[PDB]
């Protein structure tokens, strides 16, 4: 049992919200690399922790991430001209480089100190693994960019599906680390037809790991069928792989009630599907399942496209593409799920571990501890699944 | 003159709102029987007094009405599977029967209950009881469904405003002489009198009024008397015509939304069928309303008001008499500000409603039994009427039953 | 900086807000003459300072601006029947003359005279319907504004209903620097200078202020200035530098705290000044093309104002068509009410700072009981005007003797 | 077995064609009474036998059917003004009354006797059983309007679903005399609406008459297969009418007016006792032919080839036979895919298609007979007494003997 | 120069038409495997040589291809139920098998009937059928662009509303790449040359012809040339020059006289060849974005194939996105059947000329009992491939030992 006050602490991320300041101590994904295109390419709107951002690739191929609004009079730089090593606002011709210096002011006698003085709120950025990463916490707190759990280096294929979801981050993550749901919700899609697991969790410093224990066809005398989802705090999940490639979900709070859900497949080129394969398989294709902004066309008004006939004709949910089955469940709990009223049981140990871990971490960090996960996962402490006796993937 | 405070009191239904608790002391329509369909059918979304509900018919053909959200993690049950005695949440495969019993849990070894209300099918509607369980009366018949051999045709519309203004419009004999002047024509009336003399008689369940107009002849010793019955909290028995009867009941969905049910009832040989009614009122689903019964007419489209029709001599230039009503209800805004109303002679019925329902909710707040419950409710023999009546006779005294044969 | 409270004070108009009361000390455009049409024509919804209004023209041809909501029980009179010298509500058939007298109630014995509906004195000038929306005993006689001297003038209006607060809109009209930047693909129109950083000079007046924007001209920048001069007329009019054929004015009426009716006027001699539809084509404010039937822009944040990226890499500055749509993309993205708290201004925003200083002054003064800015003997007239000329560096531009362009 | 020239004889109706003038020997439905509205009401467009017609109700309530094109310079009279006992073309203000008399020529001096001496094509008309009818034959062949087969008297409720279909009429009528199809196509819809038989293969039996033929379909009952027949009797009333087997409460009729060679007005009618017969909208709902939901304002269907008639594949995997909603819509899916004019030249017909074969024989025979100058089939001295029926009937009483009347009370 | 009649002979495929009979001597793609999917899947409508077809995979997984119209009264089998070993017509419940056999006729007693259906084969992502005389059906051999089952073959399908021949002409026309696709396959694809006007040579074979486009290489143009070799495999298949990672083929199938199914293929080693959706995305031929559910393009003459005039000013050649889409606009605007009568050809069109000659000759011969081009021991096999390579100025390209790309 949690309280309204506890729920706000965990979930809110905008402005001063403790969880926000915590999360900004980690390098965060801002948008997809496919969004910023070639040098001088079209500016792009993104949103993180309640802050509206421009992103764009300059003449030299450097990618900046900056406050969306012009330091002059707050017009949106997303309309700006991205040329000649800059991004120039349309209103008065102020030009910012990717580091947020004002290179020029078309309209102000630049033979005067306003050009040199004025810096524009801008952020360090890194391109890794198909995403633009930014560091949006305090300047000096900025760690070296250490390649994450799900991309050793870059001889790996990474295939991303992005979705902008209109609900809070914490419910979306919970759903990643929820072993039981796969046996009901995903049961027309997903070596065990076992609907009920026994849950066991072992906490670490990056987050936690948990194994879910199911009975295979028979041989459950000697056998446990184990599915180990790792939680990498604050917002990543390493989904138990398949025979071919690895699967991770990382969520980024755009604000209190919206989230950038990245669902990744990754591994050996020979074995990991290309972006458009992945997306079609997940039913998350721009132009078909998503609008040009990676928001979903499935929605509450059309009931996530549910087909009652497919349901009567055997299909469990009548919803195409497994994440969209998650999305229907997630969005219906509401913009921020009211955890106060939850009725949890043996199958939800994982969600409870996450609740505990994060509330502690934010409390800790808010009392001045180092932020959870910024300690002294990694590319070979990831997820697993095997029929392991009683008591990553590549080529 | 009302206060901003009394108007909150009269109007608000959500949460603890007094008028809320009061209303949940009657049986209430949740949705139509047509919506629920065959046993094992598609679950249905509904809303009442600011609660979200699933309605579904199970394999036995029993209808459940329950909180919309799963007792587990609050996922919408409206997506669940309705089959094999129960409704199953998609997420973790919890399954409820209609009574709220968590029959089975897919991922786990009278354990846990889910909020679920008693239900009752009657005259084309699924009723439920949302008051404290121990208060539930036995389902008497409403005053507009004698028995099962009565044809009951229902127009449902979901209107985006507060309930009270919608009812007030049912108990407002004057309006039909202006607003519906092109649709209820000297439908046909034996009077050109637009200004009816109003008279009221308070009762145990609400009240009756009369609207005494000058008939097309004999007005020396003759009134044309129209009588309407208000059945608290939110029901009006409209004067019939001489083939069938008319009734309106309004369920508040929340503080600014109402399920408006407009019924035609009587003897099947003489009462129009559902779709016929709908076409007449222009409330046909897929023509006038979307698949959830919300109008396609709205402020942006000006309820399709035809400015030429109006220069041609149609009065409102909006097709379908209730839509003409809707135009007026919705413009007063999502809760009418009765603080700023300048009422007159024709508003006597509305005034009695204003007073009675305030007394009732005040009374009820101080621990009185809710208006119209108990020994007090109306039934078949209380009714509306219309007839040419001699001025020597009191209308209070007129012995009218519902038109039939 | 400015403080949060100052911004609130300067911007909000709804209900009791001082700026609201102040602005209602001036006759206000409510809507266009062409909206109200013929005697006994369709009634028309309008909005000013957060009140909903009906405009209609009775059988006699008098135009009325009253409260939208029926005095009886509050239905909208916009649905009413406009005939026989009044507007009849559809609900119970109360009928109101333009003056707000209730002529008749179909539902009542006259045992009618009692009730008066909120109604405002009206005036028809320069293709607009005007109303005096403040305390009646303080209504001035209607004099001709600076941009419509008398009746032989052509006045061509683009009306646009912008979903943002009025002050950022006017700010955009008293800003000469932006024409070099935003409008560089458009006002590249007649301009005898390619200066981007004009020097700004102000002259406070009793009705507002004249500013001037001095650029180096194309020839003889040695001893000559290109002078463009704009007049701010409180509370929300701008007189824009004319071209050599007609004049150009902006008047903004706030419909509420976050919406403004925006009027962009071409005016001058009938045979030099474009007609209404030419003006809307040029500005891309054509109803049915660029605007819906209520004058709201079909361009919006979601469509990115139809900004065209290929057109931009092709040499077009903004990629947005219609010079004002270009303003519009800037204004609406600053937010419903612009946060001046966060501005970082330079020498170019001098006029803008004058505006904020003058108008904060005038509202503070007004809430003390000073006469409201630009009322009475102080009001600008025909003889105040904007202008563009090449002027000697040795002549004060304030002294330069300009008249509005005609012939 | 049939050839191309037989098919054109049977099917084509436009101006030239024999089948056309054979059909113009009967009164024909032109449009619903509902369409024509009030006196002075909006004019309506209709089309029969390749002729464009205006339909309007004049100031007196008299209903005219005329040619669509103004007799002046050929503008469409559908756009005209319907007032003051006439219909005035917008172009030059010529005004016609319901009998094609030119009342006025607003732009011609009445000093010119053109006014008195121009006549516009117009047909005799009749309002009956919810429909406007016109006689389109030569004037002097016009019969009296005898009350027809499926609207006995005036106190009968007649509930009409109209549907304009873009194919030739014959293949549609064929659809209505084909008792076999319902056990496949309407198999999820007439779940054994009720039928007392699980029997698909019905032994057919014909019997010529003077107006058409009565046929029956003998089916094994779920009860007393030993010595009991379940008769399902259709009547074909030439040219293009079918009295379908009425269910327990009301009678069902179909009548098809060819709009031209490749389009057909299809009227599907429920008729009987006011208390027993459903109303227009309830019927249209049932049938899924509601204007504004399943059809546009011209009674044209929204279901079409392009959208696969809203066939729902998931519904069909759920055990729904056709995956199409509304039984006529299932017929339509089939009738239209056969193409604008079905090529009977490739038909591989069988014992269950006897009905259709007899239909072909008759109309091919009666059209050549008429093409020769004999009275057209159905005309001469050849109403509601002969009807469809259905019963469990003993095995030694011939069904051509059965005394069954139209379903009333 | 060609005559109206020859053009008729070359292009028509429906019914009588000889070029119809000739083509129906080859195995023909009918539709994609993806379309029929699961056993008991949704029946698919197709169209070859002027006949409508039903395709469907049955309970066991066999794929039948048949005449669309039911043998009984000619309704569409496309609307039928595909279960339990058959496709059953909805009308009267006749049920066919993949082979044409009527297993059952619901409304007909129980106490030989056969429907037009063709031999089928699944390969390389396609359902093929043999739609010519049964006893002239050859064993199905691997086509030159999909050798074995360990190839990755990724197909884009687009139903195109013009005649097949102008579409194949477009595949064998090398000089077009340096004009139409100049913004797409630049000095994103890269070619080792800037030369637009190449010296061409043609070698006629039994199965069609090979030809070579000799561009001068960016460097060493004196003693080495850049050879790009296309292969025409009759009747309507082209093997396009590979890139360095994968091969590219185009097969066309006449749906009728004025509509072709166009299949544009990427093939090679799994580790080097794109998957379907990557292919489609790159060519902008994605179902739901560029094409409707039937693979018909959303680009068309009405919308000018989405020609972006601003991008053309920016320096994009065609302003049409997706290199095949640039092709489509040229092909379609030529008209449903291109009138070669009005063609004025030149050097660059040598291969096209060669096609017109070969195929006119092949069809004339065929009519008088010659064997159909590229059947029997004459057939192209996988040993045939297109290549690009920098080759010594005095090596005969005809003899170069080139194998299709793989590693
Ligand atoms: S607001 Fe961006 S340059 Fe002025
Ligand atoms: S929320 Fe319904 S079972 Fe989990
Ligand atoms: S509200 Fe207008 S007359 Fe009653
Ligand atoms: S064409 Fe009809 S009046 Fe002249
Ligand atoms: S038409 Fe195919 S079964 Fe009768
Ligand atoms: Fe999931
Ligand atoms: Fe009403
Ligand atoms: Fe501007
Ligand atoms: Fe049928
Ligand atoms: Fe090409």
DSSP C219-251: S-TTTEEEEEEEEEETTTEEEEPP-SS-EEEEE
Q: How many CB pairs under 8 A join A and D?
A: 16
- CB contact under 8 Å between A90 and C335, yes or no, is no
**Is D150 exposed, middle or buried (CB count within 10 Å of its CB: 0-12, 13-18, 19+)?**
buried
Query: Is the CB–ligand 1 distance for residue A281 below 6 Å?
Result: no
Report the run of H or E that residue A132 belongs to, with start and end: strand A131-134
Q: Report chain B's terminal Cα–Cα distance, integer Å.
A: 45
Query: Is the CB–ligand 4 distance for residue D321 below 6 Å?
Result: no
Chain B's closest residue to C105, CA to CA, is B195
Which spans in D153-263 are helix H?
A: 170-176
The C-alpha atoms of residue B139 and residue B26 are separated, in whole angstroms, by 9
Question: Which residue reads 């995403």 in tokens?
Answer: A131
- For CA atoms C286, C290, C295, C297, the dihedral sign is negative
**D13 and D259 in contact (C-beta within 8 Å)?**
no
Bridge-based pairing state of the strands E189-190 and E185-186: parallel
**B76 and B67 in contact (C-beta within 8 Å)?**
no
Which residues in E lie closer than 8 A to residue C310 (C-beta atoms)? 308, 310-311, 313-314, 316, 319
CA E77 to chain centre: 26
Chain B's closest residue to A197, CA to CA, is B107
Which residues on adjacent β-strands are paired with residue E86? Answer: E83
Give the determination technique. X-ray
Say which DSSP state B37 is in: -
Which ligand has the nearest atom to the CA of C182? 8
Q: Which residues of B touch D (CB under 8 A)?
A: 268-269, 272-276, 278-279, 284, 286-287
Bridge-based pairing state of the strands A258-267 and A207-214: unpaired
- CB contact under 8 Å between B195 and C73, yes or no, is no
The C-alpha atoms of residue C49 and residue C16 are separated, in whole angstroms, by 10
**3-state secondary structure at position C252:** strand
The C-alpha atoms of residue D68 and residue D374 are separated, in whole angstroms, by 32
Which ligand has the nearest atom to the CA of C172? 8
Question: Which residue reads 């025909």 in tokens?
Answer: C382
Q: Which domains does chain C have, with CATH numbers?
A: 4-138 (2.102.10.10), 154-399 (3.90.380.10)
Residue D84: Cβ within 10 Å count: 13
Q: Which chains touch B (3 or more CB pairs under 8 A)?
A: A, C, D
Q: What residues does ligand 2 touch, defined as CB less than 6 Å away?
A: B 70, 72-73, 75, 89, 91-92, 94
Structure tokens at A148: 């994450």
Query: Which is nearest to D64 in space by CA: D79, D50, D77?
Result: D77
* Residue partners of A146: CB distance under 8 A and separation at least 6: none
Which ligand has the nearest atom to the CA of B167? 7
Bridge-based pairing state of the strands B63-67 and C86-88: unpaired
Has D271 been labeled as part of a binding site? no
Which ligand has the nearest atom to the CA of C96? 3
**C125 and C101 in contact (C-beta within 8 Å)?**
no
Which residues on adjacent β-strands are paired with residue D54? Answer: D45, D66
- CB contact under 8 Å between D184 and E106, yes or no, is yes
Q: Which residue owns the Cα nearest ligand 2 atom 1?
A: B73
> Chain A: nearest CA to B396, how far in angstroms?
50
The C-alpha atoms of residue A19 and residue A27 are separated, in whole angstroms, by 15
Q: Which residues of E touch A (CB under 8 A)?
A: 270-271, 274-278, 280-281, 286, 288-289
| Alpha carbons within 13 A on the beta-carbon side of D228 | 11
Question: Which residue reads 């003449």 in tokens?
Answer: A59
Say which DSSP state D39 is in: T
Q: How many helices (H) and strands (E) does chain E have?
A: 7, 21
Chain D's closest residue to A310, CA to CA, is D314
Query: Which is nearest to C254 in space by CA: C231, C232, C235?
Result: C235
Query: Is the CB–ligand 5 distance for residue E404 below 6 Å?
Result: no
Q: Which residue owns the Cα nearest ligand 4 atom 3?
A: D92
Say which DSSP state D101 is in: B
The C-alpha atoms of residue A88 and residue A81 are separated, in whole angstroms, by 5
Which residues in E lie closer than 8 A to residue C315 (C-beta atoms)? 313
- CB contact under 8 Å between C315 and E310, yes or no, is no
**C351 and C241 in contact (C-beta within 8 Å)?**
no
Query: Which is nearest to C166 in space by CA: C233, C258, C301, C238?
Result: C258
∠ at Cα A23 (A19, A26), nearest 5°?
165
CA A82 to chain centre: 27
> Chain E: nearest CA to C316, how far in angstroms?
10
Question: Which residue reads 């309106």 in tokens?
Answer: B248
The C-alpha atoms of residue D46 and residue D53 are separated, in whole angstroms, by 5
- CB contact under 8 Å between E278 and A280, yes or no, is no
Residue D396: Cβ within 10 Å count: 7
* Residue partners of B127: CB distance under 8 A and separation at least 6: B27, B28, B29, B30, B119, B120, B121, B139
User: Which of C89, C105, C106, C117 for a ligand 3 pocket mutation test, highest count of atoms within 8 Å of Cβ?
Assistant: C89
**Is E70 exposed, middle or buried (CB count within 10 Å of its CB: 0-12, 13-18, 19+)?**
buried
Ligand 2 nearest-atom number relative to CA B106: 3
Ligand 10 geometric centre to CA of C37 (Å): 58
* Residue partners of C407: CB distance under 8 A and separation at least 6: C269, C272
Mutation site, A87, A107, A114, A118, interface C, largest C CB count within 10 A? A107
The C-alpha atoms of residue E25 and residue E379 are separated, in whole angstroms, by 12
**B128 and B145 in contact (C-beta within 8 Å)?**
no
- CB contact under 8 Å between D293 and B287, yes or no, is yes
**3-state secondary structure at position B131:** coil
- CB contact under 8 Å between E311 and C308, yes or no, is no
CA distances from D365 to D177, D236, D359 (A): 18, 15, 10
Say which DSSP state B338 is in: G
Query: Which is nearest to D242 in space by CA: D135, D156, D149, D154?
Result: D149
Mutation site, A329, A337, A355, interface B, largest B CB count within 10 A? A329
Query: Is the CB–ligand 4 distance for residue D70 below 6 Å?
Result: yes
| Alpha carbons within 13 A on the beta-carbon side of D390 | 21
- CB contact under 8 Å between D338 and E90, yes or no, is no
Phi, psi at residue B104, to the nearest 5°?
-155, 150
Please report the beta strands in E282-392, taking only residues with DSSP state E, as ranges in sequence order: 387-392
* Residue partners of E49: CB distance under 8 A and separation at least 6: E13, E14, E20, E23, E24, E28, E131, E254, E255, E256
**C323 and C181 in contact (C-beta within 8 Å)?**
no
Say which DSSP state A370 is in: P
> Chain E: nearest CA to C281, how far in angstroms?
21
> Chain C: nearest CA to A118, how far in angstroms?
9
User: Which of D91, D95, D108, D114 for a ligand 4 pocket mutation test, highest count of atoms within 8 Å of Cβ?
Assistant: D91
The C-alpha atoms of residue C360 and residue C1 are separated, in whole angstroms, by 13
The C-alpha atoms of residue E228 and residue E55 are separated, in whole angstroms, by 38
Query: Which is nearest to B324 in space by CA: B166, B165, B180, B189?
Result: B180
What Å resolution does this PDB entry report?
Answer: 2.7
Chain B's closest residue to A194, CA to CA, is B107
- CB contact under 8 Å between E74 and D200, yes or no, is no
User: Which of C67, C69, C75 for a ligand 3 pocket mutation test, highest count of atoms within 8 Å of Cβ?
Assistant: C75
Which residues on adjacent β-strands are paired with residue D254? Answer: D242, D268
Which residues in A lie closer than 8 A to residue D312 (C-beta atoms)? 309
Phi-psi region of C181 (alpha: psi -120 to 50; beta: other; left: phi over 0): alpha
Structure tokens at C269: 């001699």
Query: Is the CB–ligand 4 distance for residue D94 below 6 Å?
Result: yes
CA distances from E325 to B150, B285, D294, E264, E280 (A): 66, 43, 37, 12, 12
**E159 and E255 in contact (C-beta within 8 Å)?**
yes
Say which DSSP state D141 is in: G
Bridge-based pairing state of the strands C154-162 and C259-268: antiparallel
CA distances from A273 to A156, A266, A395 (A): 12, 8, 14
Q: How many helices (H) and strands (E) does chain B have?
A: 9, 19
Phi, psi at residue E294, to the nearest 5°?
-100, 0
The C-alpha atoms of residue B49 and residue B59 are separated, in whole angstroms, by 28
CA distances from C293 to C35, C284, E15 (A): 10, 15, 56
Query: Which is nearest to A106 in space by CA: C322, C182, C189?
Result: C182
- Nearest CB among B178, B307, B337 relative to C91 is that of B178
The C-alpha atoms of residue B333 and residue D254 are separated, in whole angstroms, by 51
The C-alpha atoms of residue B116 and residue B126 are separated, in whole angstroms, by 14
């Amino acid at each position: 049992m949690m309280t309204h006050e506890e729920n706000e602490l965990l979930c809110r991320v905008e402005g001063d919200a403790p969880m926000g300041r915590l999360m900004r101590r980690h390098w965060t994904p801002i948008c997809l690399v496919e969004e910023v295109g070639e040098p001088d390419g079209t500016p792009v709107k993104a949103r993180a922790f309640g802050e509206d951002l421009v992103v764009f690739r300059d003449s030299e191929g450097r990618v900046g991430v900056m406050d969306e609004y012009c330091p002059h009079r707050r017009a949106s730089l997303v309309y700006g001209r991205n040329e000649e090593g800059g991004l120039r606002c349309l209103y008065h011709g102020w030009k910012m480089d990717v580091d947020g210096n004002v290179l020029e002011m078309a309209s102000e006698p630049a033979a005067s100190g306003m050009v040199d003085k004025v810096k524009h709120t801008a952020y360090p950025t890194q391109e890794w693994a198909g995403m633009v990463w930014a560091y949006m916490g305090p300047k000096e707190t900025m760690p070296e960019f250490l390649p994450p759990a799900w991309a050793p280096t870059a001889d790996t294929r990474v295939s991303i599906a992005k979705v902008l979801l209109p609900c809070n981050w914490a419910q979306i993550l919970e759903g990643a680390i929820d072993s039981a749901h796969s046996s009901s919700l995903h049961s027309s899609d997903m070596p065990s037809t076992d609907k009920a697991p026994r849950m066991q969790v072992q906490r670490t410093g990056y987050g936690f790991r948990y194994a879910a224990l199911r009975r295979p066809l028979s041989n459950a005398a000697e056998n446990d069928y184990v599915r180990s989802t790792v939680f990498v705090a604050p917002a990543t999940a390493l989904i138990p792989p398949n025979n071919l490639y690895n699967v991770a979900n990382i969520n980024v709070p755009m604000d209190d009630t919206n989230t950038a859900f990245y669902f990744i497949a990754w591994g050996h080129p020979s074995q990991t599907p290309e972006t458009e394969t992945w997306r079609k398989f997940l039913r998350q294709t721009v132009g078909v399942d998503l609008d040009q902004n990676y928001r979903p066309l499935r929605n509450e008004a059309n009931k996530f496209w549910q087909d009652r006939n497919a349901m009567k004709a055997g299909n469990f949910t009548g919803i195409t593409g497994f994440p969209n089955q998650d999305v229907a469940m997630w969005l219906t709990m509401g913009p921020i799920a009211d955890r106060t009223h939850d009725r949890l049981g043996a199958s939800d140990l994982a969600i409870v571990e996450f609740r505990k871990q994060m509330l502690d971490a934010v409390k800790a960090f808010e009392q001045g501890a180092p932020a959870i996960g910024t300690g002294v996962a990694t590319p070979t402490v990831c997820s697993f699944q095997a029929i392991v006796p009683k008591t990553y993937v590549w080529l």
